[PDB]
Structures are given as C-alpha cells and as structure tokens.
Amino acid sequence: STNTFNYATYHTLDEIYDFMDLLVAEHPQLVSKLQIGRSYEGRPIYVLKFSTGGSNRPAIWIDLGIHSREWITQATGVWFAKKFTEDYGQDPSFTAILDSMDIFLEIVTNPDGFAFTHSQNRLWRKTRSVTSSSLCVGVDANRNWDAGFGKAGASSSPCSETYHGKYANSEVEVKSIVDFVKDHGNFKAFLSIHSYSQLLLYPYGYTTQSIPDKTELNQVAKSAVAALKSLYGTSYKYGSIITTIYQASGGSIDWSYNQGIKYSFTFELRDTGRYGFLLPASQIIPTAQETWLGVLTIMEHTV
Numbered sequence: 001s002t003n004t005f006n007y008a009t010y011h012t013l014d015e016i017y018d019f020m021d022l023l024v025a026e027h028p029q030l031v032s033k034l035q036i037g038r039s040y041e042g043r044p045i046y047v048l049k050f051s052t053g054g055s056n057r058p059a060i061w062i063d064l065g066i067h068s069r070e071w072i073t074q075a076t077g078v079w080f081a082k083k084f085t086e087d088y089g090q091d092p093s094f095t096a097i098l099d100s101m102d103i104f105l106e107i108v109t110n111p112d113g114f115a116f117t118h119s120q121n122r123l124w125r126k127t128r129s130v131t132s133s134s135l136c137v138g139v140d141a142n143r144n145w146d147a148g149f150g151k152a153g154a155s156s157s158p159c160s161e162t163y164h165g166k167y168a169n170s171e172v173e174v175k176s177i178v179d180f181v182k183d184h185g186n187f188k189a190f191l192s193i194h195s196y197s198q199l200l201l202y203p204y205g206y207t208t209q210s211i212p213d214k215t216e217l218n219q220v221a222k223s224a225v226a227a228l229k230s231l232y233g234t235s236y237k238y239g240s241i242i243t244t245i246y247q248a249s250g251g252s253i254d255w256s257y258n259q260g261i262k263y264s265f266t267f268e269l270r271d272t273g274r275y276g277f278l279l280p281a282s283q284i285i286p287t288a289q290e291t292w293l294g295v296l297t298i299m300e301h302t303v
C-alpha cells in the first residue's frame, strides 16, 4: 500500500507507476490516473488528477522529471501525491485549494529517459526519440515547447544535451501535455519541477522582455522561497529564467505563460552542486517537504 511504500529512497519507473495504482485504489474519490499519451518508445504517460468534483474546475498543472536524471523530482512527485491524499480534509489551506481547484500531477514526464537512467545511463536527461541521420538519440524536452523555439538558448545539434528537436512539440512527451492543457482549457497555474540549483523561476527564458505580471509573480516566488526556507533553512534564489540562469528557449513555463496561464513557475530543487543530480536519498523527504510549502504557497496565490 502507499502506507508501506518507502518515500525515502529512489524508485524505478514500474515502482512509481505501481505507487500510482495503489494510490488510486486507496483514494478513489480523490485521485484518478489519466493516460495523456505514450512516450516515444511506447510507455504510457500518466497524469494523476486530484479533484473533489466540479466540472473543468480551475486547475494546477505540475510536471516532474521532464529531465530524467533529476531523480529528486520524480521522488518529490511521489511524496506530493501521497501528501495530497493525506492532507485533504486535514489541512485547512490545502483542503481549501482542492475544494475549488483540481491538481494534475505528472510525476514522470519523461518515462523513456527515466528507465534509461536506471538501465543504461544515470545521467541521461533527454527523451529517447531517434533522430534521423544522427548517431544520437533524444531531445531536451524542456527546449521543445512553442516558446521562442529554436532560438538561442537551445541547440540544433542532435547529440547536444540541449537539442530542441526538429520543430516545437516534436516530442510526444511534450505534445501530450500541450494537447491536454489546451483541451482542458482551464489551467491557472503550471509548475515545472527540475533539479538542481535551488531556484524558483518565472518567465521568460527565451527573451529579456519582462512579463507583464512580473511584480506579482516575483512577490509570489519571493513568498514561496521564504516558505520553503522556513523548514530547513534551504536558500533559494528567484527571478526570471533569463536573468537568473541565462537564455533558454522552448521552455515549458514560457509556453504556458504565453497560453495565459499566469502562475507559471519552474522549480530547480536541491542541491546547489555538491551532489548535483545524484542527490542522496536521505535528502528526498526534507526536499519534498520544503518544496511542498513553496508549491502550496504558489497554489494559495492562485485560488
């Protein structure tokens, strides 16, 4: 059961998918599992929908693990999923959130890369799409979105870790989210979880022009990182993608903000580079916990 599940260790693709089935079984009135597409290599892409009803309620999107090696994110997603089911009807603010909003949680946004990080290459980041006329595989899925696509901040070299693919939304993992979000039509927040560097970022990555909503999103980020910090003292920086970590094109929150999803943020979780992507399992739960406060803080500014 999800009560027996070990949240303080890293899991396989199958173990996470299994976790999802266990959670849906234990909480049929709160969580359901949607398949929004398949991965390049044919794995199902699963989004957990947390909802107390209504129809097409204003929604919060959270993608984790779009970069497969950032294992702290998938691990955080699993923890989040469990916590949603624990806190509804217990926590005032979260109960409040779930009463008015749906949450869509994609724990493994890049299943093919995730399996590859377990079977072949722990540090694999990209999808696993086959590039015609190349010896290399995979696209940086967070450079595949239709926001400044192909512009500086991503690579046209197929062997590059930042290769953006042949055209925006070329990756099924990405098109799947796009089609889902577009069809849903009522997303108010869109959260992309990554590691590492301890950043909370708002758009844009692809351009120096400030977003109209900068003052608000900046305050929200400031609030979020402060809430996150209160737990363990973890220090995050926040700002636009391009002023905080330089130009990046084809990014997810740049796309979503441009769809009118105002509350678009990207988290870069622990740490700052000591362990990097190989963050120790013993940090999974504390990271999850502090990140939760930050996320919850953002959801509150959305309701």
Ligand SMILES: [Zn+2]
Binding pocket: 067, 070, 193, 194, 195, 196
């Ligand atoms: Zn990443």
